[PDB]
RNA sequence: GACUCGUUCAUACUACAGUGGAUACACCAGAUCCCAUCAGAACUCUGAAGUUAAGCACUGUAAGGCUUGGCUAGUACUGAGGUGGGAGACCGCUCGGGAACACCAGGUGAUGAGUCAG
RNA sequence: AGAACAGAAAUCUCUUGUAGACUAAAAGGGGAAAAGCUUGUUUGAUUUCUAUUUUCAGAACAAGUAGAAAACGUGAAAGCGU
RNA sequence: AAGAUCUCUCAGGAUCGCUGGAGUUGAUUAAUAUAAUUUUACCAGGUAGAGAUAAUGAUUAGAGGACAGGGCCUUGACCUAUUCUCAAACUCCCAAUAGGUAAAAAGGGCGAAAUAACUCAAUUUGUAUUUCACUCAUAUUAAAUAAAAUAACUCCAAGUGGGC
């Protein structure tokens, strides 16, 4: 059905988005995006891992969807649904077109740069190896080279864990859904 | 003090929403009610109104009298009786908005407010 | 203040600006040497022909 | 395919952010004498006298003046040859240039300096300096103030 | 949404300060200034008239890049010195004011003896252009009276007759600059009521000018004029915020 | 102190406050005539009885905005060289040039001509 | 946010409103004391002639830009209108 | 040379371009003209980039609030501060490279005097020209550097206009 995908590892040609000029695109494969315990407070979790790009890879929309489902299933089997949040940190947005003259729209794709997170897991400290393993399962569903990492941040914040604790101690940091708002001392109360 | 809330404009509306004659009769009724020639709406002529000032306006308001809920936020009001009425109120210095050299905003603490306008209406 | 510049490279396959600079510099035949007065302007011109010249 | 008068002018002729709105009144007062140098900068708050694309950002001598028009001699590269073109524009687009003013300022400063020098019979190199090499010098650095460095480890 | 969004401030482009304030037109000014560009050092002198509630102000203006130079200027409250103590907002006053400015300008040039202009009411002279000055050029407006006074004085300012009374009455213009209608209104009001007459033209009553006398006084004055022209700082503010915060924590 | 013409065209804006009215601005008083309307609201004309309430001026605000400066960052990017590296994607080195947003700190005006009033 | 019939729309009023409207028609530019909308007066959508720009051979047509000699139109006037 | 414009034109032709010869003019005075160059001035820019909390279009989430359906509550819409990722035909901002103009003697200075039917209010108010004066670097040359005049310019004509 689809082209065999060895065609699209190279990410030449300009970007070309779903747009008023182009029209008519088939649907993106992934509509799911984030999953897990999505409503969890910033206080509850504190561990974070990332699966990070290196090639300049294109990343098929379908591949992305598959990777997400694989990741999710691995966490759910391991630590269940109280204990994590899986956030896809990339999107398809670029249209690919083919002949049966100029092509016709046929699929969509994501085009990461080097050194960018693909899949992110927010979780609790006991479960970071499990999450790392989930990402490792995920990597086999992507074209190109990727490495798994862990961070010294509180997860879904700019702040280091120690910084987060320090700010929390002196009351400068407010939890505001998903992540945290930093008080900047401006105007009346 | 100088800060006296008074009538600034009175507008009287009659709409039939249709063609001539009935519209003309309404305009004649409005004219008899107060003298000044009516002026009219659009074409998608449809409706009529006139504006009043001063002693003439006060007489129309006075006959009008014979509710707390339905004053505007801005400090104006109307009522229904067939015929429609709208009463526009201000302190003086309303001229600052329209006088051609200097056209500009009045201060917030000089705008009418709902509560003061209601208090004036009960008082009057 | 002065700089002796020695050319290092053939006639063939030379960018057009580089050829022009060489002509002004005054190094045509391939192992030609000349003294050049260090300034700002001379140094910039020298910078353009740099991969094609040794100097000191 | 097509190549009409305002072709491809989108961002070029459009105004910068917060620079919309009519040509300032003061700007009509500026002086233009014959042979003055003058830039051709497009506007679009004025429509009459708008010049063709190429003469944007070019600068030339004024050769002729009318009621609101100014003739400008501009060089144009046509294949193997520059040739002189008489672009008639209106005043809103023509701007009094500064490139000339550097030279003119230099003449004035030089004249005064030369007159004084010549009066004293003190021979002088009035011509431009054109930055030489750095001369030798002796420099005190405190031995406690100096900092020493190494390239950073990777992270 | 809230219209006074951050974005709304951020995009905003202000109109020029004088236009924002509302004093100047700009469109009229740019048209007014420009001379034909092949002419050189022809500065197109504008006769600027602005009608303030108290009094009309007549200046001779020349546009320059670092801003307008005023050569002669006259205000209506000078007419007191020339025997008119009252009515300084008036049309009659404006005609006088314009005339005074023109004569003083000529005296400064030293061309007062060169042109003695128009006597009473019915080489080439120096030229100027009337300013609209943001008021409508509606028929019978005060600026035209000022223009007429300037012209009668000696300045050449090209004009139609259209915006004097009637679509032409020269006799009505003569009555008006003399002030005869103002007198008529005074007589009319006195006949109507004595309380209204005294309350209205109260200053006139105090000075003691009968309606009849106004034209004579204005004429005498007119003849005479033609013959004879603190911030705080950041360290301090920082302190102020600290003090305010401590007090606010205690207070409520 | 104030005004008239302006200039730069947000450090000049906006929003909310406070503070100021000798003379001045203004609001404000009135409709006979010129004038203008649906309406003396505007505009026009004619006043000078009242008043700082507003306009206006001045200042304030951990103000928003705007504006300098740092810092982002020698990061991103890039001209020239390379029988350099990399299977490829792409990435170093040599001679050079070099950002932006955010963030943080300061700032919130200056001024030409003419005039009136102690 | 208010005002008989009156509702999501009808008209009227006040507040907020830098353009989110409208500008014959593609799409992009430009425009708020206007270029928009409303109103008044009009016919310069005129005759004659240059210098020229665009494409380009620096030919042509065409479309313009800047003038000049006439005669006028409008505005109080500068002006603006080929 | 395989560019270019026009061609019942695409295997052609014309006409430009690029080439040779002939000639004059100019240089022949380490020079001025001049230069596929830099310099110092001075501009003109909206691409890589960067941005989404700057506008337009996309676009994923929750948090805190005062209008629509049902029984304090639920689904919301709707706001407000946020958040994930974005655009050849989006743009607050924005490089490098490339491009233009500038760098004095047939000129420029500061003066005088003339001339005109133009200009201006101005027979002197300017303009512009013209004529006289006075005087600007030059013993490295009004910034370098230059087998920089082997230059200009005219004529007559070729071949070429499939390219890679």
CA distance D38 to D99: 9
Exposed/middle/buried for residue B109 (C-beta within 10 Å: 0-12, 13-18, 19+): exposed
Query: What is the SS3 assignment for B63-84?
Result: HHHCCHHHCCCCCCEEEECCCE
A97: three-class secondary structure by DSSP: strand
D130 neighbourhood in chain C, CB within 8 Å: 39-41
How many residues belong to chain B?
Answer: 124
CA distance B87 to B12: 9
Torsion of CA D17, D19, D20, D21, to 10 degrees: 160
Phi, psi for C43 (deg, rounded to 5): -60, -45
Phi, psi for A4 (deg, rounded to 5): -80, -5
Residue identified by tokens 């407006």 is E141
Binding site, annotated residues of A for Mg(2+)? 13
CA distance A178 to A42: 6
With an 8 Å CB cutoff and a minimum of 3 pairs, decide whether chains C and A touch.
no
Q: Nearest-CA neighbor of A52 among A144, A131, A141, A116?
A: A116
Cross-strand bridge partners of residue E47: E60, E130
Phi, psi for E195 (deg, rounded to 5): -60, -50
Q: Please answer whether residues A38 and A85 qualify as being in contact, where contact means their C-beta atoms are separated by less than 8 angstroms.
A: yes
Residue E161: CB partners within 8 Å, gap ≥ 6? E168
CB pairs under 8 A between B and E: 11
Task: Name the token pair of C39.
Answer: 């300034």
Contacting chains of C (3 CB pairs or more, <8 Å) are D
Residue E117: CB partners within 8 Å, gap ≥ 6? E102, E151, E152, E153, E154, E226
* Nucleotide lying nearest to D128, CA to C1' measure: H143
Cross-strand bridge partners of residue B84: B13, B80
Helices E170-178 and E213-227: crossing angle, nearest 10°?
90
Q: Please answer whether residues A125 and A46 qualify as being in contact, where contact means their C-beta atoms are separated by less than 8 angstroms.
A: yes
Cross-strand bridge partners of residue A151: none
Q: Please answer whether residues A174 and A167 qualify as being in contact, where contact means their C-beta atoms are separated by less than 8 angstroms.
A: no
CA distance A4 to E184: 103
User: Could you check: is the Cβ of residue A19 within 7 Å of any atom of nucleic acid strand H?
Assistant: yes
**Helix (H) / strand (E) containing A48:** strand A47-53
Interchain contact, C41 vs D130, CB within 8 Å: yes
CA distance E105 to E61: 11
Residue E33 has its nearest CB partner, among D25, D66, D69, at D25
Phi, psi for E52 (deg, rounded to 5): -85, 160
Closest residue to H44 (CA to C1') is: D57
Q: Nearest-CA neighbor of A26 among A72, A95, A83?
A: A95
Distance in angstroms: CA D88, C1' G65? 6
Q: For residue E50, give Cα distances in angstroms to C3, E32, E133.
A: 74, 16, 6
CA distance E175 to E50: 23
Residue D104: CB partners within 8 Å, gap ≥ 6? none
Q: What's D37's DSSP letter?
A: E
Chain E residues 159 to 178 whose Cβ lies within 7 Å of strand F are 165-167
Q: Nearest-CA neighbor of E114 among E124, E104, E99?
A: E124
Residue A14: CB partners within 8 Å, gap ≥ 6? none
Nucleotides of F under 7 A from a protein CB: 3-10, 12-18, 24-29, 32-36, 38-57, 59-66, 80-82, 88-91, 95-96, 103-116
Q: Which method was it determined by?
A: cryo-EM
Q: Is E36 on the interface with D (CB under 8 A)?
A: yes
How many residues belong to chain D?
Answer: 155
E135 neighbourhood in chain B, CB within 8 Å: 100-101
Total Cβ atoms within 10 A of residue B46: 14
Total Cβ atoms within 10 A of residue E125: 16
Query: Entry resolution in angstroms?
Result: 6.7
The distance in angstroms from the start CA to the end CA of chain D is 54
Sign of CA dihedral E74, E78, E84, E89: positive
Mutation choice for E interface testing from B99, B101, B105 by most E CBs within 10 A:
B101
CA distance A63 to A109: 9
Q: Is C41 on the interface with D (CB under 8 A)?
A: yes
CA distance A30 to E228: 94
B50: three-class secondary structure by DSSP: strand
CA distance E163 to E173: 11
The region that residue B93 occupies, defined by phi over 0 for left and psi between -120 and 50 for alpha, beta otherwise, is left
Q: Is E66 on the interface with D (CB under 8 A)?
A: no
Strand order from edge to edge, sheet including E129-130: E69-75, E55-62, E46-52, E129-130
Calculate how close chain E gets to B104, using CA atoms only, in Å. Answer: 9
Residue D99: CB partners within 8 Å, gap ≥ 6? D37, D59
DSSP assignment string, D73-141:
EEEEEETTEEEEEEEEEETTTEEE-SHHHHHHHHHHHHHHHHHHHHHHT-----S-----PPPP-----
**Helix (H) / strand (E) containing C42:** helix C41-49
CA distance D12 to A13: 27
Q: Please answer whether residues A120 and A27 qualify as being in contact, where contact means their C-beta atoms are separated by less than 8 angstroms.
A: no
Q: Is E134 on the interface with B (CB under 8 A)?
A: yes
Task: Name the token pair of D108.
Answer: 């004035």
Residue A53: CB partners within 8 Å, gap ≥ 6? A112, A113, A114, A115, A116, A117, A118, A144, A146
Total Cβ atoms within 10 A of residue A121: 27
Exposed/middle/buried for residue A63 (C-beta within 10 Å: 0-12, 13-18, 19+): buried
Interchain contact, E64 vs D68, CB within 8 Å: no
Q: Nearest-CA neighbor of B10 among B70, B64, B68?
A: B64
Residue of D nearest to C42 (CA): D132
D129 neighbourhood in chain C, CB within 8 Å: none
Contacting chains of E (3 CB pairs or more, <8 Å) are B, D
């Amino acid at each position: 059905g689809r082209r065999p995908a060895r065609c699209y590892r190279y990410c030449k040609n300009k970007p070309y988005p779903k747009s008023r000029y182009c029209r008519g695109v088939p649907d993106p494969k992934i509509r799911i995006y984030d999953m897990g315990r999505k409503k969890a407070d910033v206080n509850e979790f504190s561990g974070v891992v990332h699966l990070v790009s290196y090639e300049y890879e294109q990343i098929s929309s379908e591949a992305l969807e598959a990777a997400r489902i694989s990741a999710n299933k691995y966490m759910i089997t391991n630590c269940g649904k109280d204990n994590f949040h899986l956030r896809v940190r990339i999107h398809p947005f670029h249209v690919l077109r083919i002949n049966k003259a100029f092509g016709k729209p046929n699929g969509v794709v994501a085009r990461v740069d080097i050194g960018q997170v693909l899949l992110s897991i927010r979780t609790k400290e006991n479960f970071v190896s499990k999450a790392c393993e989930a990402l490792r399962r995920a990597k086999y569903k992507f074209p190109g080279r990727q490495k798994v990492f862990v961070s010294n941040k509180w997860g879904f914040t700019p702040f280091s864990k120690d910084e987060y604790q320090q700010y929390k101690k002196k009351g400068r940091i407010i939890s505001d859904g998903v992540s945290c708002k930093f008080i900047r001392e401006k105007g009346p109360l | 003090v100088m800060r006296e809330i008074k009538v600034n404009k009175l507008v009287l509306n009659i709409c039939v929403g249709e063609s001539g004659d009935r519209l003309t009769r309404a305009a004649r009724v409005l004219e008899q009610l107060t003298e000044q020639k009516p002026i009219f709406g659009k074409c998608r002529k449809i409706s009529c109104f006139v504006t009043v000032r001063g002693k003439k306006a006060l007489e129309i308001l006075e006959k009008g009298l014979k509710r707390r809920k339905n004053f505007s936020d801005t400090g104006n009001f109307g009522f229904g009786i067939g015929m429609d009425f709208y009463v526009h109120l201000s302190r003086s210095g309303y001229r600052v908005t329209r006088r051609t050299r200097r056209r500009s905003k009045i201060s917030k603490t000089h705008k009418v407010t709902k509560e003061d306008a209601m208090k004036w209406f009960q008082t009057k | 203040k002065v700089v002796f510049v020695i050319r290092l490279k053939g006639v063939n396959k030379l960018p057009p600006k580089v050829r022009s600079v060489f002509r002004l510099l005054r190094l045509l035949q391939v192992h030609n040497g000349v003294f050049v007065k260090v300034n700002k302007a001379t140094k910039e011109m020298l910078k353009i022909v740099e991969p094609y010249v040794t100097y000191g | 395919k097509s190549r009409g008068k305002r072709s491809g002018t989108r961002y070029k002729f459009s105004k910068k952010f917060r620079k919309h709105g009519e040509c300032t009144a003061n700007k009509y007062l500026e002086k233009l004498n014959y042979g003055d140098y003058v830039d051709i900068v497009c506007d679009s708050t004025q429509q009459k006298g708008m010049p063709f694309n190429y003469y944007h950002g070019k600068t030339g001598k004024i050769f002729h003046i009318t009621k609101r028009g100014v003739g400008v001699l501009v060089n144009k590269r046509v294949k193997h040859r520059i040739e002189q073109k008489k672009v008639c524009v209106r005043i809103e687009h023509v701007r009094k240039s500064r490139c000339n003013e550097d030279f003119l300022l230099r003449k004035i400063k030089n004249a005064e300096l030369i007159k004084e020098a010549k009066l004293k019979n003190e021979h002088i190199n009035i011509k431009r300096k054109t930055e030489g090499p750095k001369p030798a010098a002796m420099i005190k650095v405190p031995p406690s103030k100096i900092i020493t460095i190494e390239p950073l480890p990777f992270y | 949404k809230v219209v006074k969004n951050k974005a709304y401030f951020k995009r905003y482009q202000v109109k020029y300060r004088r236009r924002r304030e509302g004093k100047t037109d700009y469109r009229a000014r740019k048209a007014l200034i420009l001379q034909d560009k092949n002419k050189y050092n022809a500065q197109k002198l504008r006769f600027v008239v602005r009608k303030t509630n108290s009094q009309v102000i007549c200046q001779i203006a020349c546009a320059h890049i670092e801003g307008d130079k005023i050569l002669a200027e006259a205000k209506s409250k000078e007419l007191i010195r020339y025997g008119i103590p009252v009515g300084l907002k008036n049309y009659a006053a404006a005609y006088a004011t314009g005339l005074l400015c023109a004569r003083r300008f000529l005296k400064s040039l030293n061309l007062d003896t060169q042109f003695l202009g128009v006597e009473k009411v019915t080489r080439k002279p120096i030229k100027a252009f009337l300013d609209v000055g943001i008021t409508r050029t509606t028929t019978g407006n005060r600026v035209f009276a000022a223009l007429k006074g300037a012209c009668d004085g000696g300045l050449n300012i090209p004009h139609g007759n259209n915006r004097f009374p009637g679509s032409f009455n020269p006799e009505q213009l003569r009555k008006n600059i003399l002030g005869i209608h103002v007198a008529e209104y005074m007589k009319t009001l006195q006949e109507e009521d004595n309380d209204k007459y005294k309350t209205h033209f109260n200053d006139y009553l105090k000075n003691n000018i009968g309606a009849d006398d106004i034209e004579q006084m204005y004429l005498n004055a007119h003849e005479k004029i033609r013959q004879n022209p603190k911030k705080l700082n950041a360290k301090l503010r920082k302190k102020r915020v600290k003090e305010k915060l401590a007090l606010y924590v205690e207070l409520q």
